[PDB]
Design an enzyme around this catalytic site. Structure first.
Site, mmCIF file in Angstrom:
data_model
loop_
_atom_site.group_PDB
_atom_site.id
_atom_site.type_symbol
_atom_site.label_atom_id
_atom_site.label_comp_id
_atom_site.label_asym_id
_atom_site.label_seq_id
_atom_site.Cartn_x
_atom_site.Cartn_y
_atom_site.Cartn_z
ATOM 1 N N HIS A 252 -0.733 3.261 -2.189
ATOM 2 C CA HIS A 252 -1.731 3.063 -1.103
ATOM 3 C C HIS A 252 -1.237 3.606 0.249
ATOM 4 O O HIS A 252 -2.054 3.639 1.193
ATOM 5 C CB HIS A 252 -2.165 1.617 -1.012
ATOM 6 C CG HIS A 252 -1.162 0.649 -0.495
ATOM 7 N ND1 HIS A 252 -0.504 -0.221 -1.340
ATOM 8 C CD2 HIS A 252 -0.797 0.322 0.769
ATOM 9 C CE1 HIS A 252 0.264 -1.024 -0.618
ATOM 10 N NE2 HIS A 252 0.115 -0.688 0.682
ATOM 11 N N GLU B 178 1.006 1.723 -8.966
ATOM 12 C CA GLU B 178 1.147 1.529 -7.490
ATOM 13 C C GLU B 178 2.471 2.081 -6.963
ATOM 14 O O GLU B 178 2.776 1.810 -5.788
ATOM 15 C CB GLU B 178 0.914 0.061 -7.122
ATOM 16 C CG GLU B 178 0.555 -0.164 -5.651
ATOM 17 C CD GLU B 178 -0.621 0.634 -5.105
ATOM 18 O OE1 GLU B 178 -1.486 1.110 -5.904
ATOM 19 O OE2 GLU B 178 -0.645 0.830 -3.862
ATOM 20 N N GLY C 279 2.761 -5.394 6.860
ATOM 21 C CA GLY C 279 4.034 -4.870 7.371
ATOM 22 C C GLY C 279 5.159 -4.926 6.345
ATOM 23 O O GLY C 279 6.169 -4.275 6.609
ATOM 24 N N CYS D 147 4.864 -4.077 2.952
ATOM 25 C CA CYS D 147 4.676 -3.158 1.794
ATOM 26 C C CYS D 147 5.778 -2.105 1.827
ATOM 27 O O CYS D 147 6.131 -1.592 2.913
ATOM 28 C CB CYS D 147 3.278 -2.556 1.715
ATOM 29 S SG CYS D 147 2.062 -3.844 1.307
#
Length: 182
Positions: free
Chosen positions: A41, A72, A146, A148
């Site tokens: 992402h 991911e 904040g 990730c």
């Protein structure tokens, strides 16, 4: 404060950079040579900022399992003049549950941040932001925007990177040794 935090600090001090895309600032784990990982992402493009230096992306691969389900994890090769310490021998070979993990973050917003998250479950399937996702680890800590890209470790293992939360639980994507064979 103890041997879990010791291992986590050793990883942060040598194997992380601050990555910036159009989608934010992320903790980024360097694995070996010029190869690093970041949550998918982050939407990595042709150019990324690494510690505020404009850096060409030589390759970027958004991983999916063999059922064509999102994992991911994006593996990025950076046009950087320096290699990472090789930490592939700290990566697990198989999906697993863990005890006594630490989540470590280093960004402009959260420098030198370490969180004892405790027990880590092999959660498996998660609908992550509407996207079916596999190989998710779960910990019972109220993680925030904040974090990730944050690194999840036990003593002696680098097991995942933080990719989301629901306000009460946090979720990481597994790192497996097989992602980084060359």
């Amino acid at each position: 404060m103890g041997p879990g935090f010791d291992f986590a600090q050793a990883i942060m001090k040598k194997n992380t950079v601050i990555a910036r895309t159009e989608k934010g600032e992320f903790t980024m784990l360097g694995v070996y040579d010029r190869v690093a990982v970041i949550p998918t992402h982050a939407s990595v493009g042709e150019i990324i900022y690494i510690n505020d230096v404009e850096t060409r992306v030589l390759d970027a691969c958004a991983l999916r399992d063999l059922t064509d389900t999102n994992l991911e994890i994006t593996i990025v090769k950076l046009d950087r003049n320096q290699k990472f310490r090789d930490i592939r021998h700290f990566l697990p070979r198989c999906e697993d549950d863990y005890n006594d993990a630490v989540l470590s973050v280093h960004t402009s917003k959260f420098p030198n941040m370490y969180i004892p998250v405790g027990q880590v479950t092999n959660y498996g399937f998660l609908n992550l932001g509407g996207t079916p996702t596999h190989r998710i680890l779960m910990y019972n800590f109220p993680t925030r925007a904040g974090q990730c890209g944050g690194v999840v470790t036990t003593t002696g293992k680098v097991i995942g990177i933080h990719v989301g939360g629901n306000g009460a639980q946090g979720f990481a994507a597994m790192l497996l040794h097989s992602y980084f064979t060359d």
